[PDB]
């Protein structure tokens, strides 16, 4: 109910104006209806311009109708797109991940398909073979700063 995408777009535009930083929106395992709604609401809010090169956000979308491998590795794609900006232009990027819940359940499905780890361990945010090795890439390097906002 509460206007949230407006707050995300405001954070994007404000970090892009005040500072010189861009933003990456990861859409890991999310409803394509909501994803299209956000894409349009951003187009008609100036954050994205289809007829310019002054857009303030890059989008990475992994939909729910895609295999667990997709929805698991689609969090790292946006992370890498923001890692470039950070470690190549010194910006303070703003990386959104629509859900960590989706990412961890996708990783749990991935490890259930390989049938090597019981389905009671899921994805462990501390192990480097799961979410940890991802969540630690989002820090304050002495070359820049990624920051992750997670609905």
């Amino acid at each position: 109910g509460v206007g949230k995408t407006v707050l995300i777009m405001e954070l994007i535009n404000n970090v892009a104006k005040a500072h010189g930083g861009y933003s990456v929106f990861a859409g890991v395992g999310e409803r394509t209806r909501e994803g299209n709604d956000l894409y349009h609401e951003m187009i008609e809010s100036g954050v994205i311009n289809l007829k310019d090169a002054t857009s303030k956000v890059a989008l990475v979308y992994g939909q729910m109708n895609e295999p667990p491998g997709a929805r698991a590795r689609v969090a790292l794609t946006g992370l890498t797109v923001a890692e470039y900006f950070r470690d190549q232009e010194g910006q303070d990027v703003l990386l959104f991940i629509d859900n960590i819940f989706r990412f961890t359940q996708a990783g749990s499905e991935v490890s259930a398909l390989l049938g090597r780890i019981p389905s009671a361990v899921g994805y462990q945010p501390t192990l480097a073979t799961d979410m940890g090795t991802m969540q630690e890439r989002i820090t304050t390097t002495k070359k820049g700063s990624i920051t992750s906002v997670q609905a």
């Binding site: 019981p118 009671a120 462990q124 192990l127 480097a128 073979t129 890439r137």
Partner: protein
């Protein structure tokens, strides 16, 4: 320079199958071609299951794996103090190689029955609640259990910082060298921790073993044992150490992944059959020796992060069964204003009174009894105006003491100042002051006593008890200050 070797049948997830190595030992350190080390955990008729202490991207199939001939060991010594190392001792602070000359195994056995003596000397943390109601001793294993973001790391940092007064001091028998094993924590938080321990000049005597979240599961599994060996060095050579595993739940998770990838039969909650063995052989090495062996000590403060107070889980139950007590933190206390959010009823110390100086014992018996009397009736509040006056005084004094237990961050109080303020709190002197001013009081009063009455605190610290002389002087100072406090 010929070394017995093997090939890599398979690599990945931190688990390398190695064909050959017909003379490798169980728990032996192997060395790959990329420079990475590893531990041979599974010895099977046709191959060896090795865990790699690094990333598995530097090894491919057919890669040569050399032996080393040694059980996994890490360098120990005083050359570690002030450094930040990984689970294997290799310095990651970028300040040159560790100039240590001796190494110690990570899987040594704990001392037996004979080399031990009872826990008697206190291990001052600086937190009023901990040092008063849930005391700790030297050679004790005091668990710190709680939810996420409740102030466990903070209690460990305060305990590490507090020993500055004894380390910079002159006494050699009251010096306590700290060790902070970090397991499964972001590198940024370890950086905050090291800058905070160097801002307080505490890194001068502290070791940090960091096995972060991006570190391989074998590294997070090994880190506590490397830290405990570094501490066991001091413990066996006559000095007094203290080790904080923050935390053991994530070391258990790393061991669980390792065991599942080594094809070992899972147990409850998918943990291996011997995770109790893991944690108990880690924790029983925290002992207190006798004078015939050196009189050393090694206090362990294992940390456990539960999920919604679930101390009836597997790993919390194990670590509670192994330790000598617990310090239960809460999110409800953390929100209702108590910080440090220590739960006094659930927390316990099985050594307890044996690990206190006489002054803190004198005041803490009365404090703990009155706090029990407060909690047994604490639900009766919000209608106190309609109940017995003695129970109303119990409720009021209880609120007074509970707010006497709050404390700011990175400010560990000396023991004599602790007993001073708790004295001024339990003798009824605050039943006149309303609760919203107890913090103002405690602050101003403690500043007054440390500024104008240094000799009193010096004598109380040199004796450790509140003698009736110092008792009368406390009457004096408390009443004269309180008479003037706004």
């Amino acid at each position: 320079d010929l070394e017995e070797t093997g090939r890599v049948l398979s690599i990945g997830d931190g688990i390398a199958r190695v064909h050959g190595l017909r003379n490798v030992q169980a728990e032996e350190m192997v060395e790959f071609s990329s420079g990475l080390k590893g531990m041979s955990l599974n010895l099977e008729p046709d191959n060896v299951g090795v865990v790699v202490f690094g990333n598995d991207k530097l090894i491919k199939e057919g890669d040569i794996v050399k032996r080393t001939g040694a059980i996994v060991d890490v360098p120990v010594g005083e050359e570690l103090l002030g450094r930040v190392v990984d689970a294997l001792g290799n310095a990651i602070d970028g300040k040159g190689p560790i100039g240590s000359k001796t190494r110690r195994r990570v899987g040594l056995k704990a001392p037996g029955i004979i080399p031990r003596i009872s826990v008697r000397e206190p291990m001052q943390t600086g937190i009023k609640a901990v040092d008063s109601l849930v005391p700790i001793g030297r050679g004790q294993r005091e668990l710190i259990i709680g939810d996420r973001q409740t102030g466990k790391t903070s209690i460990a940092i305060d305990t590490i910082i507090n020993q500055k007064r004894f380390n910079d001091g002159s006494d050699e028998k009251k010096k306590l060298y700290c060790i902070y094993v970090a397991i499964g924590q972001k590198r940024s938080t370890v950086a905050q921790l090291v800058k905070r321990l160097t801002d307080a000049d505490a890194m001068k005597y502290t070791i940090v073993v960091s096995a972060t979240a991006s570190d391989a599961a074998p590294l997070q599994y090994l880190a506590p044992y490397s830290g405990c060996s570094m501490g066991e060095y001091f413990r066996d050579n006559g000095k007094h150490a203290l080790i904080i595993y923050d935390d053991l739940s994530k070391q258990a998770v790393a061991y669980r992944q390792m065991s599942l990838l080594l094809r070992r039969p899972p147990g409850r909650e998918a943990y291996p059959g011997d995770v109790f063995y893991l944690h108990s052989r880690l924790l029983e090495r925290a002992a207190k020796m006798n004078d015939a062996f050196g009189g050393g000590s090694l206090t362990a403060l294992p940390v456990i992060e539960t999920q919604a107070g679930d101390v009836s889980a597997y790993i919390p139950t194990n670590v509670i069964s192994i330790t000598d007590g617990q310090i239960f933190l809460e999110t409800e206390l953390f929100y209702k204003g108590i910080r440090p959010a220590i739960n006094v009823g659930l927390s316990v110390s099985r050594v307890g009174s044996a690990a206190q100086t006489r002054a803190m014992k004198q005041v803490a018996g009365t404090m703990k009894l009155e706090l029990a009397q407060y909690r047994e009736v604490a639900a009766f509040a919000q209608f106190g105006s309609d109940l017995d006056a003695a129970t109303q005084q119990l409720l009021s004094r209880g609120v007074r003491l509970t707010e006497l237990l709050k404390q700011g961050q990175y400010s560990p109080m000396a023991i004599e100042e602790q007993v001073a303020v708790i004295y001024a709190g339990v003798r009824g002197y605050l039943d006149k002051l309303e609760p919203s001013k107890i913090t103002k009081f405690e602050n101003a009063f403690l500043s007054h006593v440390v500024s104008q009455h240094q000799a009193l605190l010096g004598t109380i610290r040199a004796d450790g008890k509140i003698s009736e002389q110092s008792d009368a002087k406390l009457k004096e100072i408390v009443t004269n200050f309180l008479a003037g406090f706004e």
